[PDB]
Ligand SMILES: *[C@H]1O[C@H](CO)[C@H](O)[C@H](O[C@H]2O[C@H](CO)[C@H](O)[C@H](O)[C@H]2NC(C)=O)[C@H]1NC(C)=O
């Protein structure tokens with residue numbers, strides 16, 4: 001094992017470190033939109049439950 | 064064995080001593096950039112772990 005093999009190893013590490021890491025921001029954006037969609041789907045279920053009890057929809061989240 | 068053979072030996076030692084030693088600074092530069100790259104790749108893993116626990120990224124290294 002010699003300095004030229006070790007420079008090749010360092011060079012290839014620099015390549016793999018650059019390319020094998022995903023765009024984390026783009027991944028989290030799509031997960032975050034799923035949270036919003038899921039929370040609105042829940043708010044919709046609870047608007048219908050409030051409608052069962054009160055014959056009207058809520059304007060306030062605490063209800 | 065005589066003074067002329069010994070002067071040839073000294074002359075060739077002076078040559079091999081000059082050429083067979085690598086640029087140590089250049090080698091260490093590329094290893095040092097690997098340390099920085101590796102430490103930032105770790106800091107990135109830990110930013111995602113802090114995001115798992117806190118729903119936000121850290122601004123401070125101690126976290
Ligand atoms: C939903 O609650 C809102 C505050 O959280 C706000 O009060 C909205 O307006 C209502 O005001 C009172 C109830 O607080 C009234 O008797 C009616 O429910 C309603 N008034 C008007 C102007 O409609 C309430 N819902 C909405 C958007 O009307």
Ligand SMILES: *[C@H]1O[C@H](CO)[C@H](O)[C@H](O[C@H]2O[C@H](CO)[C@H](O)[C@H](O)[C@H]2NC(C)=O)[C@H]1NC(C)=O
Pocket residue numbers: 121122123
């Ligand atoms: C990360 O910690 C920093 C100090 O280590 C600094 O405090 C940054 O600013 C925050 O300040 C407090 C927390 O200490 C706030 O409640 C917020 O988390 C944040 N303030 C602002 C202005 O955003 C903190 N993160 C960053 C860069 O916001």
Ligand SMILES: *[C@H]1O[C@H](CO)[C@H](O)[C@H](O)[C@H]1NC(C)=O
Pocket residue numbers: 060062063
């Ligand atoms: C929801 O009900 C709780 C009690 O069960 C509190 O009265 C709260 O204020 C209610 N939310 C609103 C404001 O409608």
Ligand SMILES: *[C@H]1O[C@H](CO)[C@H](O)[C@H](O)[C@H]1NC(C)=O
Pocket residue numbers: 123125126
């Ligand atoms: C990390 O946690 C340790 C305890 O496990 C200390 O509270 C330390 O201060 C923390 N770092 C910061 C400042 O977030």
